[PDB]
Write a protein that binds this DNA or RNA. Structure first.
Ligand SMILES: [Mg+2]
Ligand SMILES: [Mg+2]
Lengths: 90, 95
DNA sequence: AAATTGTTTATAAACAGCCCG
DNA sequence: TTCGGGCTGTTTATAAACAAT
Protein backbone atom coordinates (compact mmCIF):
# COMPACT_ATOMS: atom_id res chain seq x y z
CA UNK A 1 0.00 0.00 0.00
CA UNK A 2 1.73 3.11 -1.38
CA UNK A 3 0.35 5.75 1.06
CA UNK A 4 0.92 4.21 4.53
CA UNK A 5 3.57 5.72 6.85
CA UNK A 6 7.10 4.65 5.81
CA UNK A 7 9.40 2.69 8.16
CA UNK A 8 12.07 5.42 7.95
CA UNK A 9 13.01 8.11 10.45
CA UNK A 10 12.88 11.75 9.41
CA UNK A 11 16.71 11.64 9.54
CA UNK A 12 16.82 8.73 7.02
CA UNK A 13 14.33 10.39 4.65
CA UNK A 14 16.22 13.69 4.75
CA UNK A 15 19.37 11.80 3.70
CA UNK A 16 17.56 10.03 0.86
CA UNK A 17 16.33 13.38 -0.37
CA UNK A 18 19.71 15.13 -0.30
CA UNK A 19 21.55 12.12 -1.73
CA UNK A 20 19.17 12.00 -4.73
CA UNK A 21 20.87 15.11 -6.15
CA UNK A 22 24.12 15.17 -8.16
CA UNK A 23 25.49 18.02 -6.00
CA UNK A 24 24.42 16.26 -2.77
CA UNK A 25 22.54 19.35 -1.59
CA UNK A 26 18.90 20.42 -1.49
CA UNK A 27 16.79 23.37 -0.39
CA UNK A 28 14.28 22.82 2.43
CA UNK A 29 11.31 23.23 0.04
CA UNK A 30 12.77 20.61 -2.25
CA UNK A 31 13.21 18.23 0.71
CA UNK A 32 9.51 18.63 1.59
CA UNK A 33 8.66 18.00 -2.07
CA UNK A 34 10.95 14.96 -2.38
CA UNK A 35 9.48 13.33 0.74
CA UNK A 36 5.88 14.15 -0.34
CA UNK A 37 6.59 12.71 -3.81
CA UNK A 38 8.15 9.48 -2.49
CA UNK A 39 6.15 8.84 0.68
CA UNK A 40 2.55 9.96 -0.16
CA UNK A 41 1.63 9.54 3.52
CA UNK A 42 3.19 12.98 4.02
CA UNK A 43 1.29 14.49 1.05
CA UNK A 44 -2.15 13.13 2.03
CA UNK A 45 -2.33 12.02 5.65
CA UNK A 46 0.34 13.50 7.97
CA UNK A 47 -0.75 16.54 9.99
CA UNK A 48 0.98 19.83 9.02
CA UNK A 49 3.62 19.48 11.82
CA UNK A 50 5.65 16.89 9.93
CA UNK A 51 7.41 19.85 8.30
CA UNK A 52 8.26 21.28 11.74
CA UNK A 53 9.76 17.85 12.48
CA UNK A 54 11.90 18.01 9.31
CA UNK A 55 13.29 21.41 10.34
CA UNK A 56 13.87 20.15 13.90
CA UNK A 57 15.92 17.22 12.53
CA UNK A 58 17.94 19.47 10.23
CA UNK A 59 19.01 21.62 13.22
CA UNK A 60 19.32 18.76 15.72
CA UNK A 61 21.66 16.48 13.79
CA UNK A 62 25.20 17.72 13.14
CA UNK A 63 25.38 15.61 9.96
CA UNK A 64 23.00 18.10 8.32
CA UNK A 65 24.99 21.21 7.48
CA UNK A 66 23.54 24.38 6.03
CA UNK A 67 25.40 25.98 3.09
CA UNK A 68 24.45 29.47 1.92
CA UNK A 69 25.15 30.23 -1.74
CA UNK A 70 27.82 32.66 -3.00
CA UNK A 71 24.97 35.08 -3.89
CA UNK A 72 23.82 36.35 -0.52
CA UNK A 73 21.73 34.29 -0.20
CA UNK A 74 20.16 30.99 -1.26
CA UNK A 75 20.64 28.16 1.22
CA UNK A 76 20.95 24.40 0.78
CA UNK A 77 21.00 21.55 3.26
CA UNK A 78 23.91 19.17 2.81
CA UNK A 79 25.27 16.11 4.50
CA UNK A 80 28.57 16.56 6.29
CA UNK A 81 31.32 15.29 3.90
CA UNK A 82 32.67 12.77 6.45
CA UNK A 83 29.15 11.55 7.36
CA UNK A 84 27.73 10.74 3.96
CA UNK A 85 27.18 7.03 3.35
CA UNK A 86 25.34 7.95 0.12
CA UNK A 87 22.27 6.08 1.30
CA UNK A 88 19.87 6.51 -1.62
CA UNK A 89 16.29 5.14 -1.56
CA UNK A 90 17.28 2.43 -4.07
CA UNK B 1 7.91 27.88 44.50
CA UNK B 2 7.38 28.57 40.82
CA UNK B 3 9.12 26.69 38.05
CA UNK B 4 12.55 28.27 37.77
CA UNK B 5 13.55 30.09 34.59
CA UNK B 6 16.42 27.70 33.74
CA UNK B 7 16.53 24.86 31.21
CA UNK B 8 17.04 21.23 32.28
CA UNK B 9 20.48 21.41 30.61
CA UNK B 10 21.36 24.43 32.82
CA UNK B 11 20.10 22.83 36.05
CA UNK B 12 21.96 19.59 35.33
CA UNK B 13 25.17 21.62 35.08
CA UNK B 14 24.39 23.32 38.41
CA UNK B 15 24.02 19.90 40.04
CA UNK B 16 27.18 18.40 38.57
CA UNK B 17 29.27 21.48 39.20
CA UNK B 18 28.16 21.62 42.85
CA UNK B 19 30.37 18.59 43.63
CA UNK B 20 34.11 18.51 44.37
CA UNK B 21 34.87 16.13 41.52
CA UNK B 22 32.50 17.60 38.87
CA UNK B 23 30.65 14.32 38.54
CA UNK B 24 27.25 13.13 39.80
CA UNK B 25 24.98 10.09 39.61
CA UNK B 26 21.52 10.39 38.05
CA UNK B 27 19.76 9.89 41.38
CA UNK B 28 21.84 12.66 42.97
CA UNK B 29 20.97 14.94 40.05
CA UNK B 30 17.28 14.30 40.74
CA UNK B 31 17.76 15.00 44.45
CA UNK B 32 19.85 18.11 43.81
CA UNK B 33 17.21 19.62 41.49
CA UNK B 34 14.40 18.76 43.96
CA UNK B 35 16.25 20.29 46.89
CA UNK B 36 17.10 23.59 45.17
CA UNK B 37 13.98 23.97 43.03
CA UNK B 38 11.02 22.62 44.98
CA UNK B 39 8.71 23.06 41.97
CA UNK B 40 10.15 19.71 40.84
CA UNK B 41 9.88 18.13 44.30
CA UNK B 42 6.25 19.17 44.81
CA UNK B 43 4.49 20.29 41.59
CA UNK B 44 6.06 18.92 38.40
CA UNK B 45 4.41 15.89 36.82
CA UNK B 46 6.54 12.70 37.21
CA UNK B 47 7.77 12.97 33.58
CA UNK B 48 10.26 15.66 34.59
CA UNK B 49 12.63 12.82 35.53
CA UNK B 50 12.23 11.40 31.96
CA UNK B 51 13.22 14.84 30.67
CA UNK B 52 16.38 14.83 32.78
CA UNK B 53 17.44 11.44 31.38
CA UNK B 54 16.54 12.63 27.85
CA UNK B 55 18.76 15.69 28.34
CA UNK B 56 21.74 13.71 29.62
CA UNK B 57 21.62 11.37 26.58
CA UNK B 58 20.68 14.03 24.00
CA UNK B 59 23.41 16.56 24.73
CA UNK B 60 26.96 15.54 23.90
CA UNK B 61 28.19 17.93 26.63
CA UNK B 62 26.96 15.34 29.12
CA UNK B 63 29.36 12.42 29.20
CA UNK B 64 28.61 9.32 31.20
CA UNK B 65 31.62 7.84 32.96
CA UNK B 66 32.19 4.79 35.03
CA UNK B 67 34.51 5.17 38.00
CA UNK B 68 37.97 3.63 37.58
CA UNK B 69 36.62 0.91 39.89
CA UNK B 70 33.79 0.17 37.40
CA UNK B 71 31.06 0.25 40.05
CA UNK B 72 29.43 3.69 39.75
CA UNK B 73 28.13 5.50 36.66
CA UNK B 74 28.59 9.28 36.79
CA UNK B 75 27.51 12.11 34.61
CA UNK B 76 30.17 14.70 33.87
CA UNK B 77 30.55 17.69 31.56
CA UNK B 78 32.56 17.68 28.30
CA UNK B 79 35.81 19.82 28.41
CA UNK B 80 35.26 21.33 24.94
CA UNK B 81 32.01 22.78 26.32
CA UNK B 82 32.33 23.39 30.06
CA UNK B 83 31.41 27.02 30.61
CA UNK B 84 31.30 26.13 34.30
CA UNK B 85 27.76 26.98 35.35
CA UNK B 86 27.02 27.02 39.05
CA UNK B 87 23.84 27.98 41.00
CA UNK B 88 25.58 30.93 42.69
CA UNK B 89 25.97 32.58 39.27
CA UNK B 90 22.17 32.83 38.94
CA UNK B 91 21.68 35.13 41.96
CA UNK B 92 21.06 38.87 41.51
CA UNK B 93 22.05 41.12 44.36
CA UNK B 94 18.92 42.85 45.65
CA UNK B 95 18.05 46.29 44.19
C1' DA C 1 11.76 -10.43 37.94
C1' DA C 2 11.21 -5.73 38.45
C1' DA C 3 12.72 -1.17 38.68
C1' DT C 4 16.08 2.15 37.30
C1' DT C 5 19.03 4.08 33.96
C1' DG C 6 20.22 5.27 29.24
C1' DT C 7 19.10 6.19 24.06
C1' DT C 8 16.59 7.55 20.36
C1' DT C 9 12.73 9.26 17.74
C1' DA C 10 8.50 12.10 17.28
C1' DT C 11 5.65 15.85 18.15
C1' DA C 12 4.60 20.58 19.80
C1' DA C 13 5.63 25.04 20.65
C1' DA C 14 8.06 29.54 21.34
C1' DC C 15 10.50 32.53 19.09
C1' DA C 16 14.02 35.18 16.13
C1' DG C 17 15.30 36.59 11.72
C1' DC C 18 14.73 36.45 6.86
C1' DC C 19 12.09 36.71 2.85
C1' DC C 20 8.82 38.33 -0.17
C1' DG C 21 4.37 39.89 -2.57
C1' DT D 1 9.57 51.72 -0.90
C1' DT D 2 7.55 49.69 3.64
C1' DC D 3 4.53 46.32 5.76
C1' DG D 4 3.02 42.24 7.32
C1' DG D 5 2.68 37.56 7.09
C1' DG D 6 4.73 33.31 5.85
C1' DC D 7 8.97 30.63 5.79
C1' DT D 8 13.23 28.92 7.76
C1' DG D 9 16.24 27.80 11.59
C1' DT D 10 17.19 26.95 16.52
C1' DT D 11 16.09 25.65 20.79
C1' DT D 12 13.58 23.57 24.83
C1' DA D 13 10.02 20.47 26.58
C1' DT D 14 7.19 16.47 26.81
C1' DA D 15 5.98 11.69 25.74
C1' DA D 16 6.92 7.41 24.23
C1' DA D 17 9.06 3.08 22.94
C1' DC D 18 12.44 0.73 23.92
C1' DA D 19 17.13 -1.44 25.42
C1' DA D 20 20.40 -2.15 28.89
C1' DT D 21 21.89 -2.41 33.46
MG1 LIG E 1 22.33 20.31 11.68
MG1 LIG F 1 24.95 12.72 26.55
Amino acid sequence: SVSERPPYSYMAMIQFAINSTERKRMTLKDIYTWIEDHFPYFKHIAKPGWKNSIRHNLSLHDMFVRETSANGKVSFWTIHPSANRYLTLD
